[PDB]
Amino acid sequence: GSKTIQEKEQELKNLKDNVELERLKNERHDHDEEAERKALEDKLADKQEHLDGALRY
Amino acid sequence: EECMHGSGENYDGKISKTMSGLECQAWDSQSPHAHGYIPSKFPNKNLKKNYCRNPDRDLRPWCFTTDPNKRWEYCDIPRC
C-alpha cells in the first residue's frame, strides 16, 4: 500500500545511535530553557510570568 | 551493584538520595518537579522508582530533588 499511509513507522530511529553522536552535549540536562523554546513556536507578546515549576512555587 | 565502575551508566542500585542529602523524586511522578525522563520513555535506562540513574550519560548518576528550590542534583554513589 503506497497510497495507504499506515500509522506504523517504516523506520525506527535508534536512540543509542544518538547517544553515540553526543549532540545533546548535556545541554538539555544543564538547562531545560531550551525545551520551552521548542514547545512554543513563538514567544509571548506580554510579560511572561515564567516562575519555577512547583506546587506552591 | 550499589557502586559504580566508571560514571554509573549501568548503575542499577537502590540509592535514592542526592549528595546534598535530599531524597530523589520518583521518575514516574511529576510532583513537585516536572520532567521529560519518563520511565516508559527510557525503559532501557532502569528508571526505577526514585533511584539515582544516568539517562543523559553524565559523569555522576543524578536525580530530581523533592525541594521546589532545587530542580535536580547529583547522588553521592561509591565506586567499585
* Sequence spans of domains, chain B: 1-80
User: Is A28 close to B33, i.e. CB distance below 8 A?
Assistant: no
Q: Which CATH class is domain B1-80?
A: mainly beta
Q: B24 and B71 in contact (C-beta within 8 Å)?
A: no
The total domain count for chain A is 1
Best of A14, A29, A31 to disrupt the B interface (most B CBs within 10 Å) is A29
Q: DSSP string spanning A1-53? A: --SS--SS-SS---HHHHHHHT-STTHHHH-THHHHHHH-SS--SS-------
List the determination method. Answer: NMR
Identify which of B68, B71, B75 has the alpha carbon closest to the alpha carbon of residue B7.
B75
How many other CB atoms are there within 10 angstroms of residue A19's CB atom?
Answer: 14
Domain extent for A36: 1-57
- Search chain B and give the residue with CA nearest A56: B68
User: CA-to-CA distance for A35 and B36, rounded, in angstroms?
Assistant: 10
